[PDB]
Design a protein around this ligand. Structure first.
Ligand SMILES: O=C(O)[C@H](O)[C@H](O)CO
Length: 303
């Protein structure tokens, strides 16, 4: 029987929340299509880091990618609202928003930019790490040189803390931290652990300053050529991928502080979040003007 082999990649390790996502997706696609579609999985930025990969999928040089929302505004501007600091109360809030009508509407914004966005998934809440000093209050961030993703909302937000930002593809981060080009970076525990950033970062604070969604993306032309039953199979495979992805994030978050302490990191997990929110007031006010009160309240009031 005719079979098609496609490729999907991530910037992170096979042994991570995102590796679980794409391995689960590949297994489900094969099962739900009775072997007529197979998906080869690639890790650690093989086939490109996130921005390059989203571009590649748009071009069609490979078929699929799983990416955080970080580089997405370079392609689909509507997702920026999700990247606002301190927008989501907790993972349940974020997941409910993305799975429900608000997130579905955002998926439709990908169609006109040459993707099928199969499903929302999760990277996690992001936390600040660095080599220089323990961060116990927002003032401790001032002057730190921090790598960021290629995301305009994060860059503006972190400048609000007095951080000196440098956007970089994820594939360059470990080496930049090791060499001291930047003092630090920010990422969920799922990434910090799987990327072994404990080896090149002494300090971590659970600032939880933004929620980082992720997405399964497919080249639109390729998706549209799938038979209808197979389109449905790919969507359902992605949703199952998101389920196991989120479960792994939950496990990582539950055990991660003890794990990273055992590995030698000084992890500050007791901070006054209100103080960090207050520090961003000027930039918060700009985001409120940018996205509008209705859209931000629509998300904040979701339950
Ligand atoms: O820091 C980043 O670039 C991302 O969190 C990473 O590629 C996983 O999605």
């Amino acid at each position: 029987a005719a079979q098609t082999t496609m490729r999907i990649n991530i910037s992170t390790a096979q042994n991570s929340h995102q590796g679980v996502a794409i391995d689960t997706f590949a297994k489900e696609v094969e099962k739900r299509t009775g072997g007529r579609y197979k998906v080869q999985t690639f890790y650690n930025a093989a086939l490109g880091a996130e921005r390059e990969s989203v571009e590649a999928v748009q071009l069609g040089t490979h078929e699929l990618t799983f990416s955080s929302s970080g580089p997405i505004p370079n392609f689909v501007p509507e997702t920026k609202i999700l990247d606002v600091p301190f927008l989501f109360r907790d993972k349940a809030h974020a997941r409910a928003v993305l799975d429900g009508p608000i997130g579905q509407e955002l998926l439709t914004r990908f169609d006109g930019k040459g993707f099928k966005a199969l499903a929302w998934a999760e990277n996690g809440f992001r936390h600040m790490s660095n080599s220089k000093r323990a961060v116990k209050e927002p003032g401790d961030l001032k002057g730190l040189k921090m790598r960021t993703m290629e995301n305009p909302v994060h860059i503006a937000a972190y400048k609000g803390f007095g951080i000196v930002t440098t956007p970089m593809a994820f594939s360059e981060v470990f080496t930049a931290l090791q060499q001291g080009t930047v003092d630090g970076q920010e990422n969920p525990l799922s990434v910090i652990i799987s990327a072994k950033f404990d080896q090149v970062q002494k300090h971590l604070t659970l600032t939880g300053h933004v929620y980082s969604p992720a997405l399964f993306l497919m080249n639109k032309a390729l998706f549209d050529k799938l038979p209808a039953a197979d389109q449905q199979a790919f969507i359902d495979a992605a949703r199952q991928g998101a389920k196991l992805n989120r479960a792994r994030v939950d496990e990582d978050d539950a055990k991660g502080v003890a794990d990273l302490r055992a590995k030698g990191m000084t992890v500050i997990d007791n901070i006054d979040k209100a103080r960090f929110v207050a520090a961003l007031a000027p930039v918060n006010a700009q985001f409120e003007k940018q996205f509008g009160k209705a859209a931000l309240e629509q998300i904040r009031s979701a339950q």
